[PDB]
């Protein structure tokens, strides 16, 4: 009926790592290629994603146990989970009032229609937005949002993972933290853990549709040249 | 004592091609990643170069005879001449009043010190600036500037060219145009052609120092990730 000392240190270092790698001011967005509203939004959103991958890598390196994985498994885990973690962390800027991501003035407010102008279609953006409002209605604690991202990232059921048992145990140690956290520290949350595990299944199906729609981008050199070298490396097929 | 009809059509289509691919307003510079003044200038100048390569490719495709080369020789010629053509076309924005490239307000005015903040050292920027003021003092006609770029681009003495004779003949046909042009249409220019051919030799030695200083960039992934996919493709070693 009370969190372990180990379980709160896990929560601590995961919450601190999210604060180091998530800026609520979004002030760095002025450094991206400006948005334009042909694929007019693709340079700005490709910069936005590229920046976000760098933040996700910074977060991941501070999940307890992730550094001790081989560099191969680290890369395997980041390559196939990155768009899910971005979709997850992006909920901090999502808003039900506008059904958009509000990261600034009108410039860094990302409508559904802006993201279409980046080479993605409704069949991704429709489930993605729906996912965001469901996620938003869970009204998660900071400790739960942060745990969910790390549980998502530490999925052993991902292409190319070598050490299935080592990461499965890591993901299990984190799920136990989340289950205990919700039960001890979240009133009225007895049905919440199941709803977050559901959100992971939603992420796989969004990840699948994105990577398919991304392949269609990356095969047109006129569009792929608008990406960044990190994006291309993270979302392409290698070892 | 009078230009051939063939020689003026060559001049015509080369001058029109430069106007299609060179904007004197520099209005597109707002679309680059903004400059910052660690390598703070590298994102903005990497965008500037990447844009310029796209313009040089547009110019080259309209040099008479360049389209009929194999795609291999076209790529060979563009890969090893691109930074020289950029250095050549950049003279349109250079200014002796400031010894900088003035493409806008204070933002798109590129001091010598800004370019150092993009990962290049004085041993390139010192000969480069000196090259620009010498080039500027030639006070070239539009027809000569345009011819010089195409003569630079059509150099058969470049790594990987296959059809040495076909491009040598093309470069010869263009040099004859320039020699005749200067003699017929440029009063007091009887020593000018030799001075432009000298500028080509200057370009080789600047190209050599840049590609060496670029190798030192491209081997540090933290810096190379700041480049664009076109830059990386054009300045790297492939077939």
């Amino acid at each position: 009926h009370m969190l372990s000392d180990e379980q709160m240190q896990i929560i601590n270092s995961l919450v601190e790592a999210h604060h180091k790698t998530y800026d609520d001011s979004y002030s760095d967005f002025v450094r991206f290629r400006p948005p334009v509203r042909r694929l007019s939004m693709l340079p700005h959103l490709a910069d936005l994603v590229s920046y976000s991958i760098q933040k996700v890598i910074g977060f991941a390196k501070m999940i307890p146990g992730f550094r001790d994985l081989t560099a191969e498994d680290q890369i395997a885990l980041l390559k196939s989970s990155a768009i899910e973690i971005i979709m997850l962390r992006s909920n901090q800027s999502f808003s039900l009032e506008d059904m958009s991501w509000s990261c600034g003035g009108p410039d860094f407010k990302y409508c559904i229609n802006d993201v279409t102008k980046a080479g993605h279609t409704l069949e991704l953006l429709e489930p993605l937005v729906k996912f965001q409002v469901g996620l938003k209605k869970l009204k998660l604690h900071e400790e739960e949002h942060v745990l969910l991202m790390a549980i998502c990232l530490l999925s052993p059921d991902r292409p190319g993972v070598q050490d299935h048992v080592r990461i499965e145990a890591l993901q299990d140690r984190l799920c136990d933290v989340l289950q205990a956290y919700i039960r001890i520290q979240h009133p009225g949350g007895r049905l919440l853990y199941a709803k977050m595990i559901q959100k992971l299944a939603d992420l796989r199906s969004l990840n699948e549709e994105h990577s398919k729609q991304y392949r269609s981008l990356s095969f047109q050199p006129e569009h792929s040249m608008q990406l960044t070298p990190l994006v291309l490396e993270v979302f392409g097929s290698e070892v | 004592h009078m230009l051939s009809d063939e020689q003026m059509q060559i001049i015509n289509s080369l001058v029109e091609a430069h106007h299609k691919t060179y904007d004197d307003s520099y209005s597109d510079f707002v679309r680059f990643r903004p400059p910052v003044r660690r390598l703070s200038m590298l994102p903005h100048l990497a965008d500037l170069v990447s844009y310029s390569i796209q313009k040089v490719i547009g110019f080259a495709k309209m040099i008479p005879g360049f389209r009929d080369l194999t795609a291999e020789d076209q790529i060979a010629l563009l890969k090893s001449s691109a930074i020289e053509i950029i250095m050549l076309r950049s003279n349109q924005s250079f200014s002796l009043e400031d010894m900088s490239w003035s493409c806008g307000g204070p933002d798109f005015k590129y001091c010598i010190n800004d370019v150092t903040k993009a990962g290049h050292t004085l041993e390139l920027l010192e000969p480069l600036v000196k090259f620009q003021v010498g080039l500027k003092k030639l006070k070239l006609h539009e027809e000569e500037h345009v011819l010089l770029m195409a003569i630079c681009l059509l150099s058969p003495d470049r790594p990987g060219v296959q059809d040495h004779v076909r491009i040598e003949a093309l470069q010869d046909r263009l040099c004859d145009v320039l020699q005749a042009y200067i003699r017929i249409q440029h009063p007091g220019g009887r020593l000018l052609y030799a001075k432009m051919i000298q500028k080509l030799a200057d370009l080789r030695s600047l190209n050599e120092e840049h590609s060496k200083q670029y190798r030192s960039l491209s081997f540090q992934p933290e810096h190379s990730m700041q480049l664009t996919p076109l830059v990386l493709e054009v300045f790297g070693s492939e077939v």
Binding site: I75, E238 | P221
Partner: peptide, 10 residues
């Protein structure tokens, strides 16, 4: 292979 990620992963 994964030049940037290896560097980013320290």
């Amino acid at each position: 292979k994964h030049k940037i990620l290896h560097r980013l992963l320290q």
